[PDB]
Amino acid sequence: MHHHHHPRGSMEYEEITLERGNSGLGFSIAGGTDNPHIGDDPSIFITKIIPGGAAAQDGRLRVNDSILFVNEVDVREVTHSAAVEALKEAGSIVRLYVMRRKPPAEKVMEIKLIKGPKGLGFSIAGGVGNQHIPGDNSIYVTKIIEGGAAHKDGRLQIGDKILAVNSVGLEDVMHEDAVAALKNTYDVVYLKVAKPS
Amino acid sequence: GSMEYEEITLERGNSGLGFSIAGGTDNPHIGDDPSIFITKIIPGGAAAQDGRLRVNDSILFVNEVDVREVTHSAAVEALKEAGSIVRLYVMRRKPPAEKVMEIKLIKGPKGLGFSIAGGVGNQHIPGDNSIYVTKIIEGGAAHKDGRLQIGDKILAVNSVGLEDVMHEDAVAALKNTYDVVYLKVAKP
């Protein structure tokens, strides 16, 4: 199709090579143009993994992985049936190109800070055009300044996602936007943060 | 093309900051862009001696003032009332620091025997939608030929350019090829 289904989220791609067992590849799918599995998503999703099945023993593959390419076949936009056949006619060695979301944060907390004369004494990276991590518009703490408010409080650490400044969310925003959202604060600041996993 | 932000702190000379600007809501400098652009850099000027600042840099913040969307006049004043020590948050685009070659490959049964990363939503490098060679597979066609190396930008597959494309799009552009493939590459 002319337009493909770009997914809100922090994504991860992996190429999993499988050797067909005497019982297939040992996993189940769902979705496709004729029976979209989620929302308006014609993408193919892995619904099940069969134990002692080829996919299982390899163990790279995981449920809710989305399949984009079987060998050299593009299955982003096809009928369910179409995919099943592609998966059969894929021969004994099947190169799967799959995508899924990256692991959930270790945890989410809220940190109150009181601005030093230097500001909040810490730096950031990330942002929509400025992915600090391939496929991640999130905003991370680049560096914590010694003596700075962030240091004093000591709760905040490097690599923590900053999700919100006060009532301002930083989900998928321009790097400049985030910076602005911080300059435009008063003496007290409530940071909603996410500690990496 | 390669989005880059830098915070340049300047110490006002006895002649200002020594650079000129253009743009703003009242006189957009380029297309529909109300952004403030640096048009000139005065020699022996404060900005010059620092040398971090460069023409066509876009100014986002003067100290704590947001100048993404303001009138030209507005900015000039912000730049005056900014006191003796002026912190500038600027952005620009790096332009390709590469030499460029074309590599013909003949598909092995495994495909071209190499992997990629990067893409529009998948910046392999902050501010770079370019597509890079993640890994070269041993025995794979790419290895045999030996020309291709890790970290090389792939700019085109046959007649298909990969300038600012979705990661999936690039992958598709490679699956959808025949036994022979012409790769336009860029060595950094």
The last residue of a domain, from among B71, B95, B119: B95
B156 and B170 fall within a common domain: yes
The last residue of a domain, from among B49, B69, B95: B95
A53 and A123 fall within a common domain: no
B105 and B31 fall within a common domain: no
Chain A touched by B102 (CB under 8 Å): no
A72 and A109 fall within a common domain: no
Q: How many domains does chain A have?
A: 2
| CA B61 – CA A197 distance, rounded (Å) | 33
Chain B touched by A2 (CB under 8 Å): no
**Which technique was used to obtain these atomic coordinates?**
X-ray
**Bridge partners, A46 (sequence order):** A29
Task: Test B5 with A129 for CB contact under 8 angstroms.
Answer: no
Chain B touched by A184 (CB under 8 Å): yes
B17 and B82 fall within a common domain: yes
Residue B188's domain spans which residues?
A: 96-188
Structure tokens at B28: 């957009």
Other CB atoms within 10 Å distance of the CB of residue A52: 9
The last residue of a domain, from among B37, B64, B95: B95
Residue among A74, A135, A180 whose CB faces B121 most closely: A135
Contacts with B, A 133-152, CB within 8 Å: 134-135
Q: Rounded to whole angstroms, what are the CA distances from A26 to A19, A44, A68, A83, A96? A: 10, 16, 18, 15, 13
* Segment holding B89, helix H or strand E: strand B85-93
B105 and B184 fall within a common domain: yes
**DSSP H helical segments within chain B, as ranges?**
46-50, 72-80, 141-145, 167-175
Task: Test B122 with A4 for CB contact under 8 angstroms.
Answer: no
Secondary structure string (H, E, C) spanning B50-61? HCCCCCCCEEEE
Would you say A163 and A171 are in contact if contact means Cβ atoms under 8 Å apart? yes
Would you say A169 and A138 are in contact if contact means Cβ atoms under 8 Å apart? no
B70 and B113 fall within a common domain: no
B10 and B86 fall within a common domain: yes
For A95, name the nearest residue in chain B, comparing CA atoms only.
B110
Would you say A83 and A34 are in contact if contact means Cβ atoms under 8 Å apart? no
Residue B11, domain CATH: 2.30.42.10
- Domain contains A130: yes
Chain A touched by B167 (CB under 8 Å): yes
Chain B touched by A158 (CB under 8 Å): no
The one-character DSSP state at B176 is: S
- Domain contains A195: yes
- Domain contains A96: yes
User: How far away is chain A from the Cα of B64, in angstroms, using its nearest Cα?
Assistant: 6
Would you say B119 and B166 are in contact if contact means Cβ atoms under 8 Å apart? yes
For A124, name the nearest residue in chain B, comparing CA atoms only.
B5
Task: Test A74 with B117 for CB contact under 8 angstroms.
Answer: no
Task: Test B126 with A135 for CB contact under 8 angstroms.
Answer: no
Would you say A142 and A150 are in contact if contact means Cβ atoms under 8 Å apart? no
Secondary structure string (H, E, C) spanning chain A? CCCCCCCCCCEEEEEEEEECEECECCEEEEECCCCCCECCECCEEEEEECCCCHHHHHCCCCCCCEEEEECCEECCCCCHHHHHHHHHCCCCEEEEEEEEECCCCCEEEEEEEECECCECCEEEEECCCCCCECCECCEEEEEECCCCHHHHHCCCCCCCEEEEECCEECCCCCHHHHHHHHHCCCCEEEEEEEECC
A32 and A63 fall within a common domain: yes
Residue among A13, A134, A179 whose CB faces B89 most closely: A179
Tokens 């050299």, residue? A72
| CA B137 – CA B146 distance, rounded (Å) | 11
Contacts with B, A 27-66, CB within 8 Å: none
Secondary structure string (H, E, C) spanning B3-22? EEEEEEEEECEECECCEEEE
Chain B touched by A5 (CB under 8 Å): no
Chain A touched by B171 (CB under 8 Å): yes
| CA A161 – CA A178 distance, rounded (Å) | 12
A51 and A119 fall within a common domain: no
The one-character DSSP state at B150 is: T
A142 and A56 fall within a common domain: no
Tokens 């134990």, residue? A51
Q: Which amino acid is at B19?
A: F
- Domain contains A57: yes
B108 and B71 fall within a common domain: no
